[PDB]
Write a protein that binds this ligand. Structure first.
Ligand SMILES: [Cl-]
Lengths: 195, 231, 235, 250, 244, 241, 240, 111, 243
């Protein structure tokens, strides 16, 4: 799929992901949620080739949910991200690699800190205050480099995200049909129903 | 005694008891008769029922248009071996455009049964088969024992009380061999032969099972009112 | 010790004969075939009153036109049913038609002797397979762990089998109606059961051409039990 | 065919004993005496060359074997079992270590690999335990000199000095009186020859005794010059003459 | 064929017990006693070497106490060779977990994995079980200090104080008597040695017949240190506690 | 008592199946002898053709393993041939892999290792044979190496195998005690064969015809067996002095 | 591979290895399951022969298979871990392929199938374990309680017990549990579960574990004090 | 490079009546511009009142017909000499063809 | 005791009792023989007529391997067939790789090694047949006999089965009275006689004679069955000698 953004603020992680699914010259859907909840305080957004994306995401989701049941304990966002990276690094030298790029946004309840991880289909992991996949970052990184502070509130993060989306909507040739936005914090995961 | 635990063990007198026990299962089975002339070959089988509500267990199986057999003993083992014959008859047709020789069919059955008598873990087949067929050298009748031994005969019988029918055929040898170009008379001789093995019970309409193959006759099985003619 | 696929001096497979003893210990199952349909009935035999009897599933659907009752080590039947259902549906895939009752039974029986040292032992369960097809009409088969299957007009398996089979010997005729067969299964089940027969500890079912395989409700069976009591008291 | 013995032949008895291991240890007891002594600047291992026939050339049968340039081995028990263990020990030293790290393994780790092989013969399907106890002497840079015993169970223990086989009980007592932490290698060889004389019945000379040492580097035995860091093997098998010279000062 | 010689290691007795597991436990009962005691500020592991010799090289010897990783250690009771097979598997499992999740393996997860391996040898394969009982002493940030034990059955349980090997009945009674919840490491060290001193089959308890280890947060600031005691250090702690 | 049926330890630390394999070795009731010359290694063995219906040319317990290596077997012929075929395959493989002819002692070790495996692995039985390998090795010179069912092997100055091995062994021992050398000091192999036959005659106390013996000779770069007529010439020379 | 047939028929038509596996269950600690009108309670015995135990880290007797289903057992502890792991894997595999969580009946059918498979597979022995599987189906308020055993048979129960002295507590439940009117509340259901265990347990201290499962994935384990209050009230009413 | 396929030409035609059915085809077999045979049968009686023709690549056509004839044979063995209905044969043929989805029978088939 | 319950187990004697029990099955079988002649070999066998219902000349016992080797055996007939099937595989792979037809000594060892392999494990049973076989190769004529143990030797004459002693005695006379050799046609006549003389040990049931031969002059070194006039001539010669 097309655009997936992520920004870590003071006390939360915000993930914005496009709503459009496209097959050739036709928009099949304009309300697609490109994310899966791995655990109550860990959310993963994804984008890549059709099938591979959802197959991989749900495969990861099942593994993390299995771990949670077995140990009666939620893995840290760092542990989850490292698991995901290994699966992709394993994938890249396989017969048919998963063509998926992901963003993992989570709130570590032990450290009381939000965390954002960017992992591409090769298994290249990096912890960031803000990140993007594909052609998204090309338009948005200049605004984020300018406006971002680590002490930002969730509301300020959303306003900076609106600015990033507005720039995409002006300069990107492709219509991605807006974004679904989700916030990950100490109280869990919730969706911003108006954006 | 101590040497009958498995098939891989000879006794001190050179006997294979598991094979002999498999041979015993055939003697418990219902009687079936085989006989042939120069033009036709016939199978006659006494089918057995569990009780009055039950059906009469089928004894005769078709292997090809020109070949088939009757069984006596463990029916599932006859299904396995007949399935093998069906495949071998079929391999001969598909690959060589050639109808499988009855003699070669016997050789294949012998070799299949033998492997089960020399290896650990497996067991011998618990069934005896009478194979009839018409090929390029005319009519044929074979007797299969699960020891591996296969024998070509003019006539024979296997199962319980089979000695009576076998003696009759041994007397009638010179008569029934000459029954050429007359299928009904050859079946009559077979029905009269199997009758020598009956006690208490007699041949009824759903009891009797007959099969025939010949010069211009594909392997066909007769059951029900189709054998009332011969009762 | 000794081989699993060993023949006895009499020419029987030890393990197959021993599995038949396990089936004798099982709860009673009866089948009666008529020209209007085939009826299947079973003894549930709950080990305790706290056990919710409706969860006891000893009568089972294989396809719309084939039903199946069991007796013996009922846990062993699950993989047999699974194979039967797969076989039935697979034949529908390959041939766009219903599968013959005999062919289905043969497919189940092919598993029977696949044991050695494949599975480690024979099945410890007998099956009454009842159904209907266009060629041979209403049919009832008895599938054993020996790999053998007999067709029956009527048949009883389980602990009260020989007593029930003698009763079926006298009662069965070729002009039986479906209603008559239903009452006949209930009658014979009531005769061989330890506990008193009611709608909760016994279950009926049938297979007809029109409606296919149906397990009877406890309310429907209760009426047939009440109809039985009255007709026995009538003379 | 196929190996159909996929089950253990060594099992626990009601008393908790592993019968086949005990019986293997009994076979080791019947075997010819062999011993090992550790000095400050070396290690010595020794045994009797029990010749089966005087027509047999006992030089061709080597009871004391080189595993690596700095590690040697001797045994008591069944000779054929020992021979195959030495083949496997030599190979495993390469496959599981030298081909990875580019250097020979330290004594304790090679011993560990041999022990593992012997343990697996105690648990794996369709096999009996090895009928030998090994004494493995060796040197490496960071652990220095060391001497290990390995039993049929796969258990191994480090020793200052010890003996195994026929007259081990008497020999271990003899070593306890003579051993100290200030022994030079020549003193250890002298004590080894004294200890071994007690368990030998017949001829006692360089031709009936097999003795090797782990000591100083032997550049004369290296086979090439030009690399300063390669100074030669520490393992050396003593000659028939070298043994007899030390039997005169006995 | 081969069936004739098969002992059938993985079957039930008429009473519903696993023959080989029970016999393996009988073997372990003759092994040197190993004791584990958990305190609020650390864990103690003490163990008795079996009838040693004066010519045994003690400082380079290891038969009882093994290191699985920086946070987790084990005390062994039974066949040493069998234990080393399992120890190497556990070391690998710990490193696999660390590579996958980039975090040190939780103690219970490591224990469960080894205990599952033991269980497998009792249910399938036709092989004899491992004649080994472990005491696991470890730390992680979830449950803190933890003591576990596993036996050839593959069953594992958590403890405040526990013994395995010889004279466990007597040892467990002595531990149950003198153990308290607010206990500290130094006190637990004393308890472990006193218990061994009374349960030992030897005439007297000396430094050369012991292996000893502690897991302490007594490391500079929030971190954990493993201490495998040297022969001279065991000799000193024996004098300090007043046993020799 | 299943510890006597397969190769596992008895309470005494013994392998009874190996011990019984040694007893099968003497089932043929044939005695063999091997000695070394200066340039050669000679092996002789008794030949017994009891049945008149047998083709005596096909009755043999000496085998040409490679061009350089010869092997005589003490034990039943089926196991003997089993070992012979394997040794031939091993010798050929060795040459292919390592680029030079397999030495006698190395082949002996290899066959001994195989025999050891049969004493440890339960499903494989030991071969009831003793294998005596002979050659003139390019490094070690005249060589005799013998393998048994226990997996044991060793080099020999000379050796003997069979029911009456002890009588032959002592006879040979006494000769080498006199000469004080490890071989037969003789130039030609013809005379070394004569020595071997003479000392077997003296040890066993039986006279031999040409058809009673079987002889193998190893020289540099080839091993060969003697015909009946070659042996007759050998027997004539012995009688004439 | 080791292919030996361990579970086989005997002359009288019995599979002794399966029957001996039931004896292992008889030896195991008592477990009890009771379903109320809007809940299910699982009670479990803890033998007090083992003190100096660390109750924080010791494997609990009741295991969550998913957020809405639990599994308790009696018999060999090590064996139960293998069944639980398989069940947990299958639960996620069902969600992954069918996009619905397992029904309690389905999960039970799977676990029972695994147990059965080990009674006619070569080289393996039966599980020495009987399980009580309880929970609520997704978007359903009907309580579910199932039992399995080594042979592989399974069935649904209004109330059931397994393990040592299960004969006694089953006797108690049969006379005390009314089908027409089951425990209407959580209190009544827990009280009846504790009462039943008090017939067998010995001391009502740390020997009784209770786990309450309610609809919509609402599962909670009671503490020592909460259970001790039930033990107090029961015996005070009994003194009369 | 080896080309496993070929074109043997030919043309076939099936028409269904009210109580009858015909299956026609020419008898010419060709490669490129050469004639192989002027009379090489292409339509076959497969049994159970079913006729069949697999047109295109003759080697794949002969193989499919041969297999279907074989499928009819085993249908009788396995299901008590039951007659294979035309709709059942059609479905069976689908599975013969799709069994080689990734190395197709290069034929257009009519029954 | 118990050493005879399992194959490949050495008794305290150093014997494999299971192989010795397989020999008993061989001794129980019908008589079969082999005769080595000047430029080839002749094989003959006793076929017991159990019943009149047996079709004459149909149940053929002698088997050909390749085109130049003949095989006959006594004992468990199926085991013999299994051995010949292997022999045919061995002969085929030899010719496939080396072009030339398999030599008889080479072929003999192929069977020998296979039969010997069935004395190495308890998971297999030894062969219940002694096999007489041979033919003509580049080096001339060869006759062999192979036992259940895997033991085989070359023979001037060979015999096995229930009438082996009687046969062996007759073969020994031919070897003594013909040192220069025996012709192929003579060997066929003598083969018939020996089977008839050996039939005194199976004298209850009457029998059917079956003969085959490979000869450089008479059959061009190819295996052929003796049929028609030449068979009847051998039967007449045999019948004349017993009377
Ligand atoms: Cl080797």
């Amino acid at each position: 799929m097309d655009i997936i953004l992520g920004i870590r603020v003071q006390d939360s992680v915000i993930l914005a992901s496009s709503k459009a699914v496209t097959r050739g010259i036709s928009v099949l859907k304009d309300s697609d949620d490109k994310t899966r909840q791995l655990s109550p305080h860990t959310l993963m957004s994804f984008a890549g080739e059709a099938g591979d994306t959802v197959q991989f995401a749900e495969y990861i989701q099942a593994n993390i949910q299995l771990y949670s049941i077995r140990e009666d304990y939620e893995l840290s966002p760092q542990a989850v991200s490292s698991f995901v990276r290994q699966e992709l690094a394993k994938s890249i030298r396989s017969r048919r690699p998963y063509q998926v790029n992901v963003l993992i946004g989570g709130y570590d309840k032990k450290k009381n800190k939000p965390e954002l991880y960017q992992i591409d289909y090769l298994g290249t992991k990096v912890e960031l205050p803000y990140g993007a996949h594909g052609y998204s970052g090309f338009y948005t990184f200049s605004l984020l480099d300018h406006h971002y502070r680590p002490d930002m509130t969730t509301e300020e993060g959303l306003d900076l995200l609106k600015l990033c989306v507005q720039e995409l909507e002006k300069r990107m040739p492709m219509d991605f049909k807006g974004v679904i936005v989700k916030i990950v914090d100490k109280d869990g995961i919730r969706q911003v129903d108006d954006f | 005694n101590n040497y009958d635990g498995d098939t891989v063990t000879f006794s001190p007198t050179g006997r294979l008891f598991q094979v002999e026990y498999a041979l015993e299962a055939i003697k418990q089975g219902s009687v079936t008769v085989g006989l042939r002339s120069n033009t036709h070959a016939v199978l006659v089988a006494l089918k057995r029922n569990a009780d009055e509500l039950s059906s009469y267990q089928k004894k005769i199986i078709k292997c090809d248009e020109h070949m088939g057999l009757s069984l006596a003993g463990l029916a599932p083992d006859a299904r396995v071996l007949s399935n093998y014959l069906r495949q071998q008859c079929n391999y001969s047709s598909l690959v060589f455009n050639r109808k499988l020789a009855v003699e070669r069919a016997g050789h294949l059955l012998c070799d299949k049964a033998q492997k089960n008598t020399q290896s650990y873990g497996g067991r011998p087949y618990g069934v005896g088969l009478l194979i009839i067929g018409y090929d390029k050298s005319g009519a044929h009748l074979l007797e299969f024992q699960p020891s591996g031994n296969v024998t070509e005969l003019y006539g024979t019988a296997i199962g319980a009380r089979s000695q009576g029918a076998k003696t009759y055929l041994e007397r009638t040898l010179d008569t029934f061999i000459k029954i050429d170009g007359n299928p009904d008379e050859l079946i009559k001789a077979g029905v009269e032969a199997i009758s020598q093995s009956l006690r208490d019970e007699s041949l009824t309409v759903d009891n009797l099972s007959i099969a025939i193959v010949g010069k211009d006759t594909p392997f066909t099985i007769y059951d029900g009112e189709a054998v009332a003619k011969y009762i | 010790d000794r081989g699993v696929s060993t023949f006895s001096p009499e020419g029987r497979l030890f393990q197959v004969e021993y599995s038949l003893e396990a089936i004798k210990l099982g709860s009673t199952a009866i089948g009666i075939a008529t020209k209007e349909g085939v009826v299947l009935g079973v003894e549930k035999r709950a080990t305790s009153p706290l056990l919710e009897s409706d969860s006891i599933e000893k009568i089972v659907e294989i396809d719309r036109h084939i039903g199946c009752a069991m007796s013996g080590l009922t846990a062993d039947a699950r993989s047999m049913i699974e194979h039967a259902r797969t076989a039935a549906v697979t034949h529908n895939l390959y041939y766009d038609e219903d599968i013959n009752v005999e062919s289905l039974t043969q497919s189940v029986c092919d598993l029977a002797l696949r044991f050695g040292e494949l599975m480690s032992r024979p099945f410890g369960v007998a099956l009454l397979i009842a159904g209907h097809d266009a060629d041979d009409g209403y049919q009832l088969f008895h599938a054993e762990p020996s790999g053998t299957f007999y067709r029956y007009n009527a048949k009883a398996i389980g602990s009260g089998s020989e007593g029930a089979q003698a009763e079926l010997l006298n009662e069965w005729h070729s002009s039986l109606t479906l209603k008559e067969a239903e009452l006949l299964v209930l009658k014979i089940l009531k005769q061989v059961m330890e506990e008193k027969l009611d709608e909760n500890n016994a279950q009926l079912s049938c297979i007809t051409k029109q409606d296919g395989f149906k397990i009877y409700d406890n309310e429907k069976t209760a009426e047939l039990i009440k109809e039985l009591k009255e007709k026995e008291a009538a003379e | 065919m196929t190996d159909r013995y996929s089950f253990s032949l060594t099992t626990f008895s009601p008393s908790g004993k592993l019968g086949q291991i005990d019986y293997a240890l009994t076979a080791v007891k019947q075997g010819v005496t062999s011993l090992g002594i550790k000095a400050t600047n070396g290690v010595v291992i020794a045994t009797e060359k029990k010749s089966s026939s005087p027509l047999a050339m006992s030089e061709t049968l080597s009871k004391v074997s080189l595993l690596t340039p700095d590690i040697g081995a001797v045994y008591s028990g069944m000779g054929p079992d020992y021979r195959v263990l030495v083949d496997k020990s030599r190979k495993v030293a390469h496959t599981s270590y030298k081909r990875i790290y580019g250097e020979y393994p330290p004594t304790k780790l090679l011993v560990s690999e041999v022990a593992k092989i012997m343990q697996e013969a105690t648990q794996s399907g369709g096999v009996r335990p090895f009928g030998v106890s090994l004494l493995i002497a060796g040197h490496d840079e960071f652990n220095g000199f060391s001497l290990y015993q390995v039993d049929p169970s796969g258990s191994y223990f480090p020793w200052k000095a010890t003996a195994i086989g026929k007259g081990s009980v008497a020999a271990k007592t003899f070593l306890e009186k003579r051993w100290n932490d200030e022994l030079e290698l020549e003193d250890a060889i002298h004590i080894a020859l004294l200890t071994l004389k007690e368990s030998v019945e017949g001829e006692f000379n360089g031709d009936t005794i097999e003795l090797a040492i782990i000591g100083d580097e032997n550049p004369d035995l290296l086979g090439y010059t030009g690399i300063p860091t390669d100074k030669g093997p520490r393992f050396r098998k003593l000659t028939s003459q070298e043994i007899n010279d030390r039997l005169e000062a006995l | 064929g081969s069936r004739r010689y098969d002992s059938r290691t993985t079957i039930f007795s008429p009473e519903g017990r696993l023959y080989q597991v029970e016999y393996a436990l009988e073997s372990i009962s003759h092994a040197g006693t190993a004791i584990g005691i958990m305190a609020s500020d650390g864990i103690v592991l003490a163990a008795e070497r079996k009838v040693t010799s004066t010519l045994l090289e003690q400082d380079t010897s290891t038969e009882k106490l093994y290191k699985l990783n920086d946070k987790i250690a084990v005390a062994v009771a039974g066949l040493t060779a069998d234990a080393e097979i399992l120890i190497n598997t556990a070391r690998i499992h710990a490193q696999n977990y660390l590579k996958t999740y980039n975090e040190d393996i939780p103690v219970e997860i490591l224990v469960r994995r080894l205990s599952d391996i033991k269980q497998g040898y009792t249910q399938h394969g036709g092989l004899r079980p491992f004649g080994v009982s472990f005491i696991y002493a470890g730390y992680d940030d979830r449950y803190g200090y933890q003591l576990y034990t596993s036996n050839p059955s593959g069953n594992y349980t958590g403890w405040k104080a526990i013994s395995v090997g010889a004279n466990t009945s007597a040892a467990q009674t002595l531990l149950q008597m003198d153990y308290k919840d607010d206990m500290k490491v130094d006190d637990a060290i004393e308890l472990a040695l006193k218990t061994l001193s009374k349960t030992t089959d030897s005439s007297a308890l000396t430094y050369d017949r012991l292996e000893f280890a502690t897991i302490r947060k007594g490391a500079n600031d929030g971190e954990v240190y493993q201490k495998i005691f040297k022969p001279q250090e065991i000799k000193d702690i024996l004098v300090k506690t007043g046993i020799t | 008592g299943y510890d006597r049926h397969i190769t596992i330890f008895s309470p005494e630390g013994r392998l009874y199946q190996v011990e019984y394999a040694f007893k099968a070795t003497n089932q043929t009731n044939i005695n063999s002898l091997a000695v070394r010359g200066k340039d050669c290694t000679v092996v002789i063995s008794q030949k017994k053709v009891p049945d008149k219906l047998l083709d005596p040319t096909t009755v043999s317990y000496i085998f040409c393993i490679s061009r350089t290596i010869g092997m005589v077997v003490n034990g039943p012929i089926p196991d003997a041939r089993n070992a012979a075929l394997r040794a031939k395959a091993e010798a050929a493989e060795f040459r292919y892999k390592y680029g030079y002819d397999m030495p006698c002692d190395v082949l002996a070790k290899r066959m001994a290792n195989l025999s050891q495996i049969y004493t440890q692995r339960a499903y494989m039985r030991p071969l009831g044979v003793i294998l005596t390998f002979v050659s003139v090795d390019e490094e070690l010179g005249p060589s005799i190496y013998k393998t048994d069912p226990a997996g044991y092997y060793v080099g020999y100055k000379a050796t003997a195998t069979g029911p009456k091995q002890q009588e032959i062994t002592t006879n040979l021992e006494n000769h080498f005690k006199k000469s004080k050398i490890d071989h037969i000091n003789e130039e030609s192999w013809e005379k070394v064969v004569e020595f071997a036959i003479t000392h077997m005659i003296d040890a066993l106390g039986t006279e031999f015809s040409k058809n009673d013996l079987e002889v193998g000779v190893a020289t540099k770069d080839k091993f060969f067996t003697l015909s009946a007529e070659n042996i007759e010439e050998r027997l004539v020379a012995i009688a004439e002095q | 591979g080791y292919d030996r047939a361990l579970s086989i028929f005997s002359p009288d038509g019995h599979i002794f290895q399966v029957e001996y596996a039931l004896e292992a269950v008889k030896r195991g600690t008592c477990a009890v399951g009771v379903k109320g009108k809007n809940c299910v309670v699982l009670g479990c015995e803890r033998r007090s022969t083992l003190k100096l135990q660390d109750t924080r880290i010791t494997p609990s007797k009741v295991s969550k298979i998913d957020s809405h289903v639990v599994l308790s057992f009696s018999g060999l502890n090590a064996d139960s871990r293998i069944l639980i792991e398989k069940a947990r894997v299958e639960a996620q595999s069902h969600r992954l392929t069918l996009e619905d969580p397992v029904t309690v009946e389905y999960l039970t059918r799977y676990v029972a199938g695994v147990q059965q498979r080990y009674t006619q597979s070569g080289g393996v022995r039966p599980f020495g374990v009987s399980t009580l599987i309880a929970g609520f189906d997704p978007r359903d308020d009907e309580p579910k309680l199932y039992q399995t055993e080594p042979s592989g048979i399974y069935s649904s129960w209004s109330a059931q017990t397994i393990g040592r002295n299960s004969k006694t507590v089953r006797e108690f439940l049969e006379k005390n549990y009314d089908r027409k009117e089951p425990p209407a509340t959580v209190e009544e259901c827990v009280k009846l579960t504790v009462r039943s265990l008090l017939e067998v347990v010995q001391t009502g201290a740390k020997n009784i574990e209770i786990t309450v499962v309610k609809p919509d994935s609402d599962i909670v384990a009671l503490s020592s004090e909460e259970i001790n209050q039930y033990v107090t009230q029961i015996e005070q009413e009994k003194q009369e | 490079q080896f080309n496993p396929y070929g074109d043997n030409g030919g043309t076939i035609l099936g028409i269904a009546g009210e109580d009858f059915a015909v299956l026609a085809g020419d008898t010419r077999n060709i490669t490129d511009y050469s004639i192989n045979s002027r009379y090489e049968p292409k339509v076959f009686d497969c049994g159970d009142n079913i006729v069949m023709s697999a047109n295109g690549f003759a080697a794949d056509g002969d193989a499919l017909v041969k297999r279907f004839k074989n499928s009819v044979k085993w249908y009788h063995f396995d299901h008590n000499d039951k007659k294979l209905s035309i709709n059942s044969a059609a479905r069976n043929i689908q599975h013969l063809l799709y069994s080689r989805r990734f190395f197709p029978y290069y034929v257009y088939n009519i029954i | 005791t118990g050493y005879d319950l399992s194959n490949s187990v050495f008794s305290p004697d150093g014997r494999n009792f299971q192989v010795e029990y397989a020999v008993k099955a061989v001794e129980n079988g019908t008589t079969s023989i082999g005769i080595k002649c000047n430029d080839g070999v002749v094989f003959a066998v006793e076929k017991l007529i159990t019943s009149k219902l047996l079709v004459p000349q149909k149940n053929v016992k002698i088997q050909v391997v390749d085109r130049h080797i003949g095989c006959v055996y006594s004992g468990l007939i199926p085991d013999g067939r299994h051995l010949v099937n292997r022999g045919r595989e061995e002969a085929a792979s030899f010719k496939k790789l080396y072009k030339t037809p398999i030599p008889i000594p080479a072929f003999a060892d192929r069977l020998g090694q296979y039969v010997q392999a069935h004395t190495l494990y308890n998971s297999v049973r030894p062969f219940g047949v002694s096999t007489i076989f041979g033919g003509v190769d580049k080096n001339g004529a060869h006759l062999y006999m192979l036992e259940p143990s895997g033991s085989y030797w070359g023979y001037k004459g060979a015999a096995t089965g229930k009438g082996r002693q009687s046969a062996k005695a007759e073969l020994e006379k031919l070897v003594d009275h013909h040192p220069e050799g025996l012709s192929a046609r003579e060997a066929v006549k003598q083969a018939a006689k020996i089977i008839y003389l050996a039939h005194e040990d199976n004298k209850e049931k009457d029998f059917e004679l079956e003969i085959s031969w490979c000869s450089l002059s008479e059959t061009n070194g190819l295996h052929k069955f003796v049929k028609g006039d030449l068979l009847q001539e051998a039967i007449d010669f045999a019948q004349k000698e017993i009377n």
